[PDB]
Amino acid sequence: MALFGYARVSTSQQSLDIQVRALKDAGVKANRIFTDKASDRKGLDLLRMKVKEGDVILVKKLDRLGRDTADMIQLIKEFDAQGVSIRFIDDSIDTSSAMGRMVVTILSAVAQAERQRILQRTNEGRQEAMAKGVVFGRKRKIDRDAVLNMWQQGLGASHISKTMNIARSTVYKVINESN
Amino acid sequence: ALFGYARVSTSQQSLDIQVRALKDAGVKANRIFTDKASDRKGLDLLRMKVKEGDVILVKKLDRLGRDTADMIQLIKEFDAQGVSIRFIDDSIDTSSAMGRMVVTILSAVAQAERQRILQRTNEGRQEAMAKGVVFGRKRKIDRDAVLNMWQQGLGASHISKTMNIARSTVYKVINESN
Amino acid sequence: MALFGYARVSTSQQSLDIQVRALKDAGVKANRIFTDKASDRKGLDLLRMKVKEGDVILVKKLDRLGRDTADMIQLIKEFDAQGVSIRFIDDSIDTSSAMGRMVVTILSAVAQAERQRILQRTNEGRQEAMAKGVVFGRKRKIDRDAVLNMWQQGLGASHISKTMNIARSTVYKVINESN
Amino acid sequence: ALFGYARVSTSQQSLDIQVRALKDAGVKANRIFTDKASDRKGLDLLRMKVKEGDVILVKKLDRLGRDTADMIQLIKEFDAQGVSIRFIDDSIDTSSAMGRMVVTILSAVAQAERQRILQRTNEGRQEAMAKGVVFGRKRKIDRDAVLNMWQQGLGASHISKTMNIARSTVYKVINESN
DNA sequence: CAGTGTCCGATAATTTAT
DNA sequence: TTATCGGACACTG
DNA sequence: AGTGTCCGATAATTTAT
DNA sequence: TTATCGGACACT
DNA sequence: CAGTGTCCGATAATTTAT
DNA sequence: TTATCGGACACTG
DNA sequence: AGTGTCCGATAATTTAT
DNA sequence: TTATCGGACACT
């Protein structure tokens, strides 16, 4: 019964404020609301150990507990073992029954099958972009023309890293590209 | 490279049967593995001797993992390595997205049944132990004789040599009829 | 609320007595318990029309409503339209929620996928039995040796159907087999 | 023989897009059909012009049938005839057992979402109509002029010819300001 | 004109699987 | 599935 | 004829992730 | 959803 | 003995998709 | 994904 | 040594569709 | 499940 609360975020959109907002309006106070800001899921492990027999948790929706269906279960399993139940406020399913957890784990694998496809289409769309002729990753920031002139000079490589206040390791690798 | 896996639980060793189908699929006992759950060692070994481009087989689904949870755990560890299990009875391959999903759902449901029926078994145990049924293995050793061999004033150790039976039992037997 | 009850049977094992047995112990009386003995699902159609807004039904398990997932839904859909809910006493799911019916229809298709496979293995096992050399269908009951002697006679075919008190149509077809 | 099917709902006619993929699969507009839901006639026609050994295509799953129920009804009628739909986005074929099943589950769940979100839309309509928002199409015709053309004592029919507008509306307009 | 042969569909009796 | 049972026509004679 | 009511088809609207 | 359009009716 | 070149892993900056 | 940033060795001289 | 307790591994048990 | 087996301990 003695309700807990758990939420998370992972994107540049820290939609965390929203997550919490209802966890309160449900019944549970911050005094018992846990959070990982997926930069390592620490605040979860800690929640995992604060709970005891006949506790109850609350997670906004189905994705918010675990990303990977495989261990989304492990939690629930380990959780039901202790006697703790987590509800999916958006989905409205109880870890606590059978049918509940059963249909939790049901919905997850059916929802990852969406992500798993998404990522293939995301990557297929990056392989038709890389090959098309698009610039990748991060751009050159420091003039390599300034470095190559300072090496054809026959100048000591270590000296350059403070004439141009940059990393010494990059100096070398830069010269290695143009074969 | 292709592989076969099988398992058992009951005293009814349907093991010979599972293996048969495996050979009727193309895997030899040269690449077949078995665990007689009594402790899943033989599985670990198979899980340690397959690389990318390999395919495992099990007759029934439940056969790989009874519990839905660690079932995916394997399959996950498995798809990551490059291996995939086909199930002959249900005809699903972890070699895909849906496949993997459809292994999982199947098995979740599969358990809600397994788990509810389990409860029904325990209800049946409850409605039996209360009505007056004797559980466990029934007694064998002629106790009224052992008890007559203490009443004698004989060594308890002496008993356990005279009767080809265990000594620690002898003592327990006496502290049975208070 | 005003509870109803529905059960069915289809095999030589008329396990109907059992079906009813609990439909009562649930709360509903025979006064409102319906039955088709699948010899045509009439007693269902009638139940379908006796129910009104805010009624509630009860069916032993998931198979017992409908066999074919396709219309198992139609019922539920048509049923939820009226405001009537059917429960799956063995399964413990409510037509009444969403998640309920959703997970009813979930379980059915996953359970037919069992039957659909079964029948293929049943038939595969009949095709390896027919070819193996097993007698099929129904056995000859009336001596065809007695009929063939009564036709080589040049005897009128109609006459034979009352000398041997049998069907007149079979008389003919019998002679047609031995080419 | 292979076939293509597509559909639309929104004023955002993503129709041109669905068809594109169909051609990128191998079906010509010579064997492609479309319903612009405004009434699923074009489907019926396709359902009436395929025999055994044919295969239909739709981009998304929801596209065939929105409602989970009649979705299977089609697929059932379909497997019986000898035809089967592949869905390119999800990559599932009704040409199988699991396939058919896995079409269905997918679509059931798919709806629990569709249906719950629908409710959320209606909650948003409720929290808007109560706060004080004007729904429907906004008024156009200069009523204070029509009302000034009865106050005149002019024929109502006369109005509807003078202003290039409908007559029945004229009357309704007057019984608006009691 | 009425008996002989062709051809169904609806019923009863059987099999393989659980 | 396969066997009979009622029948329905349609020609034959 | 022509003045008044009372429908359903078509247009333009809003709300929602 | 509400506003207009086409109408089709029933009465002076 | 100390400067020159090889080679990581851990961090920050970027892209494609929703 | 790709760029730098700190570093760690290991030889060279 | 040898007499008494108090564990866990192995055997034989039952209940269930 | 309860009954025996192997034991390993702590005390006269």
mmCIF file with all atom_site columns, N, CA and C in Angstrom, chain A residues 13-40:
data_model
loop_
_atom_site.group_PDB
_atom_site.id
_atom_site.type_symbol
_atom_site.label_atom_id
_atom_site.label_alt_id
_atom_site.label_comp_id
_atom_site.label_asym_id
_atom_site.label_entity_id
_atom_site.label_seq_id
_atom_site.pdbx_PDB_ins_code
_atom_site.Cartn_x
_atom_site.Cartn_y
_atom_site.Cartn_z
_atom_site.occupancy
_atom_site.B_iso_or_equiv
_atom_site.pdbx_formal_charge
_atom_site.auth_seq_id
_atom_site.auth_comp_id
_atom_site.auth_asym_id
_atom_site.auth_atom_id
_atom_site.pdbx_PDB_model_num
ATOM 1  N N  . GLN A 1 13 ? 14.972 16.797 -24.537 1.00 0.00 ? 13 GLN A N  1
ATOM 2  C CA . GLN A 1 13 ? 13.689 17.203 -23.981 1.00 0.00 ? 13 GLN A CA 1
ATOM 3  C C  . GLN A 1 13 ? 13.512 16.519 -22.624 1.00 0.00 ? 13 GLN A C  1
ATOM 4  N N  . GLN A 1 14 ? 13.887 17.229 -21.559 1.00 0.00 ? 14 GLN A N  1
ATOM 5  C CA . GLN A 1 14 ? 13.739 16.726 -20.191 1.00 0.00 ? 14 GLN A CA 1
ATOM 6  C C  . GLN A 1 14 ? 12.286 16.816 -19.731 1.00 0.00 ? 14 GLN A C  1
ATOM 7  N N  . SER A 1 15 ? 11.435 16.022 -20.379 1.00 0.00 ? 15 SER A N  1
ATOM 8  C CA . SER A 1 15 ? 10.007 15.966 -20.080 1.00 0.00 ? 15 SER A CA 1
ATOM 9  C C  . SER A 1 15 ? 9.756  15.317 -18.717 1.00 0.00 ? 15 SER A C  1
ATOM 10 N N  . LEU A 1 16 ? 10.654 15.594 -17.776 1.00 0.00 ? 16 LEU A N  1
ATOM 11 C CA . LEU A 1 16 ? 10.600 15.010 -16.451 1.00 0.00 ? 16 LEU A CA 1
ATOM 12 C C  . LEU A 1 16 ? 9.541  15.687 -15.598 1.00 0.00 ? 16 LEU A C  1
ATOM 13 N N  . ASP A 1 17 ? 9.459  17.011 -15.718 1.00 0.00 ? 17 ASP A N  1
ATOM 14 C CA . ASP A 1 17 ? 8.507  17.815 -14.955 1.00 0.00 ? 17 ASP A CA 1
ATOM 15 C C  . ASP A 1 17 ? 7.097  17.240 -15.076 1.00 0.00 ? 17 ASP A C  1
ATOM 16 N N  . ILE A 1 18 ? 6.751  16.807 -16.289 1.00 0.00 ? 18 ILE A N  1
ATOM 17 C CA . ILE A 1 18 ? 5.454  16.201 -16.597 1.00 0.00 ? 18 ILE A CA 1
ATOM 18 C C  . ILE A 1 18 ? 5.285  14.848 -15.905 1.00 0.00 ? 18 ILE A C  1
ATOM 19 N N  . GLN A 1 19 ? 6.330  14.029 -15.976 1.00 0.00 ? 19 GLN A N  1
ATOM 20 C CA . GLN A 1 19 ? 6.344  12.702 -15.367 1.00 0.00 ? 19 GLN A CA 1
ATOM 21 C C  . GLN A 1 19 ? 5.902  12.762 -13.918 1.00 0.00 ? 19 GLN A C  1
ATOM 22 N N  . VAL A 1 20 ? 6.610  13.583 -13.148 1.00 0.00 ? 20 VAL A N  1
ATOM 23 C CA . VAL A 1 20 ? 6.337  13.810 -11.736 1.00 0.00 ? 20 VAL A CA 1
ATOM 24 C C  . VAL A 1 20 ? 4.937  14.363 -11.529 1.00 0.00 ? 20 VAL A C  1
ATOM 25 N N  . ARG A 1 21 ? 4.602  15.384 -12.309 1.00 0.00 ? 21 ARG A N  1
ATOM 26 C CA . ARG A 1 21 ? 3.372  16.137 -12.116 1.00 0.00 ? 21 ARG A CA 1
ATOM 27 C C  . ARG A 1 21 ? 2.174  15.282 -11.716 1.00 0.00 ? 21 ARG A C  1
ATOM 28 N N  . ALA A 1 22 ? 1.965  14.163 -12.394 1.00 0.00 ? 22 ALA A N  1
ATOM 29 C CA . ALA A 1 22 ? 0.828  13.322 -12.054 1.00 0.00 ? 22 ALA A CA 1
ATOM 30 C C  . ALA A 1 22 ? 1.140  12.295 -10.963 1.00 0.00 ? 22 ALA A C  1
ATOM 31 N N  . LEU A 1 23 ? 2.411  11.923 -10.809 1.00 0.00 ? 23 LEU A N  1
ATOM 32 C CA . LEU A 1 23 ? 2.774  10.926 -9.799  1.00 0.00 ? 23 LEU A CA 1
ATOM 33 C C  . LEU A 1 23 ? 2.322  11.404 -8.436  1.00 0.00 ? 23 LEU A C  1
ATOM 34 N N  . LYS A 1 24 ? 2.303  12.728 -8.275  1.00 0.00 ? 24 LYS A N  1
ATOM 35 C CA . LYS A 1 24 ? 1.742  13.393 -7.097  1.00 0.00 ? 24 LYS A CA 1
ATOM 36 C C  . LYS A 1 24 ? 0.219  13.321 -7.123  1.00 0.00 ? 24 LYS A C  1
ATOM 37 N N  . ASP A 1 25 ? -0.371 13.849 -8.193  1.00 0.00 ? 25 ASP A N  1
ATOM 38 C CA . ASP A 1 25 ? -1.820 13.883 -8.370  1.00 0.00 ? 25 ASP A CA 1
ATOM 39 C C  . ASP A 1 25 ? -2.454 12.491 -8.288  1.00 0.00 ? 25 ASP A C  1
ATOM 40 N N  . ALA A 1 26 ? -1.619 11.453 -8.308  1.00 0.00 ? 26 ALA A N  1
ATOM 41 C CA . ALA A 1 26 ? -2.068 10.085 -8.075  1.00 0.00 ? 26 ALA A CA 1
ATOM 42 C C  . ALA A 1 26 ? -2.256 9.860  -6.576  1.00 0.00 ? 26 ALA A C  1
ATOM 43 N N  . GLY A 1 27 ? -1.243 10.234 -5.793  1.00 0.00 ? 27 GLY A N  1
ATOM 44 C CA . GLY A 1 27 ? -1.288 10.094 -4.338  1.00 0.00 ? 27 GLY A CA 1
ATOM 45 C C  . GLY A 1 27 ? 0.068  10.140 -3.649  1.00 0.00 ? 27 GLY A C  1
ATOM 46 N N  . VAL A 1 28 ? 1.136  9.907  -4.420  1.00 0.00 ? 28 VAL A N  1
ATOM 47 C CA . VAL A 1 28 ? 2.492  9.798  -3.872  1.00 0.00 ? 28 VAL A CA 1
ATOM 48 C C  . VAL A 1 28 ? 3.257  11.107 -3.929  1.00 0.00 ? 28 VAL A C  1
ATOM 49 N N  . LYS A 1 29 ? 3.972  11.401 -2.846  1.00 0.00 ? 29 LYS A N  1
ATOM 50 C CA . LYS A 1 29 ? 4.741  12.633 -2.725  1.00 0.00 ? 29 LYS A CA 1
ATOM 51 C C  . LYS A 1 29 ? 6.220  12.432 -3.082  1.00 0.00 ? 29 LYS A C  1
ATOM 52 N N  . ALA A 1 30 ? 6.876  13.531 -3.465  1.00 0.00 ? 30 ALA A N  1
ATOM 53 C CA . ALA A 1 30 ? 8.301  13.545 -3.825  1.00 0.00 ? 30 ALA A CA 1
ATOM 54 C C  . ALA A 1 30 ? 9.163  12.877 -2.764  1.00 0.00 ? 30 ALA A C  1
ATOM 55 N N  . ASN A 1 31 ? 8.802  13.118 -1.503  1.00 0.00 ? 31 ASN A N  1
ATOM 56 C CA . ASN A 1 31 ? 9.347  12.417 -0.348  1.00 0.00 ? 31 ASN A CA 1
ATOM 57 C C  . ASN A 1 31 ? 9.655  10.947 -0.659  1.00 0.00 ? 31 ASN A C  1
ATOM 58 N N  . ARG A 1 32 ? 8.932  10.396 -1.636  1.00 0.00 ? 32 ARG A N  1
ATOM 59 C CA . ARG A 1 32 ? 9.122  9.027  -2.099  1.00 0.00 ? 32 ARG A CA 1
ATOM 60 C C  . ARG A 1 32 ? 9.004  8.923  -3.630  1.00 0.00 ? 32 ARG A C  1
ATOM 61 N N  . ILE A 1 33 ? 9.625  9.856  -4.353  1.00 0.00 ? 33 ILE A N  1
ATOM 62 C CA . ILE A 1 33 ? 9.659  9.803  -5.832  1.00 0.00 ? 33 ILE A CA 1
ATOM 63 C C  . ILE A 1 33 ? 11.082 9.787  -6.410  1.00 0.00 ? 33 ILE A C  1
ATOM 64 N N  . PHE A 1 34 ? 11.367 8.770  -7.215  1.00 0.00 ? 34 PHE A N  1
ATOM 65 C CA . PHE A 1 34 ? 12.736 8.482  -7.628  1.00 0.00 ? 34 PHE A CA 1
ATOM 66 C C  . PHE A 1 34 ? 12.994 8.815  -9.091  1.00 0.00 ? 34 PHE A C  1
ATOM 67 N N  . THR A 1 35 ? 14.256 9.092  -9.422  1.00 0.00 ? 35 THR A N  1
ATOM 68 C CA . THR A 1 35 ? 14.597 9.619  -10.739 1.00 0.00 ? 35 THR A CA 1
ATOM 69 C C  . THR A 1 35 ? 16.015 9.336  -11.223 1.00 0.00 ? 35 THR A C  1
ATOM 70 N N  . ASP A 1 36 ? 16.087 8.734  -12.409 1.00 0.00 ? 36 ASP A N  1
ATOM 71 C CA . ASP A 1 36 ? 17.327 8.624  -13.171 1.00 0.00 ? 36 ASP A CA 1
ATOM 72 C C  . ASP A 1 36 ? 17.222 9.550  -14.372 1.00 0.00 ? 36 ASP A C  1
ATOM 73 N N  . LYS A 1 37 ? 18.233 10.386 -14.581 1.00 0.00 ? 37 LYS A N  1
ATOM 74 C CA . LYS A 1 37 ? 18.285 11.203 -15.786 1.00 0.00 ? 37 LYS A CA 1
ATOM 75 C C  . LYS A 1 37 ? 19.308 10.568 -16.720 1.00 0.00 ? 37 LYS A C  1
ATOM 76 N N  . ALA A 1 38 ? 18.860 9.579  -17.494 1.00 0.00 ? 38 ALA A N  1
ATOM 77 C CA . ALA A 1 38 ? 19.740 8.704  -18.294 1.00 0.00 ? 38 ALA A CA 1
ATOM 78 C C  . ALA A 1 38 ? 20.822 9.426  -19.121 1.00 0.00 ? 38 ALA A C  1
ATOM 79 N N  . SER A 1 39 ? 21.961 9.684  -18.481 1.00 0.00 ? 39 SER A N  1
ATOM 80 C CA . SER A 1 39 ? 23.071 10.406 -19.100 1.00 0.00 ? 39 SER A CA 1
ATOM 81 C C  . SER A 1 39 ? 23.910 9.482  -19.977 1.00 0.00 ? 39 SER A C  1
ATOM 82 N N  . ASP A 1 40 ? 23.776 2.872  -15.425 1.00 0.00 ? 40 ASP A N  1
ATOM 83 C CA . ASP A 1 40 ? 23.757 4.161  -14.738 1.00 0.00 ? 40 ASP A CA 1
ATOM 84 C C  . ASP A 1 40 ? 22.396 4.479  -14.109 1.00 0.00 ? 40 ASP A C  1
#
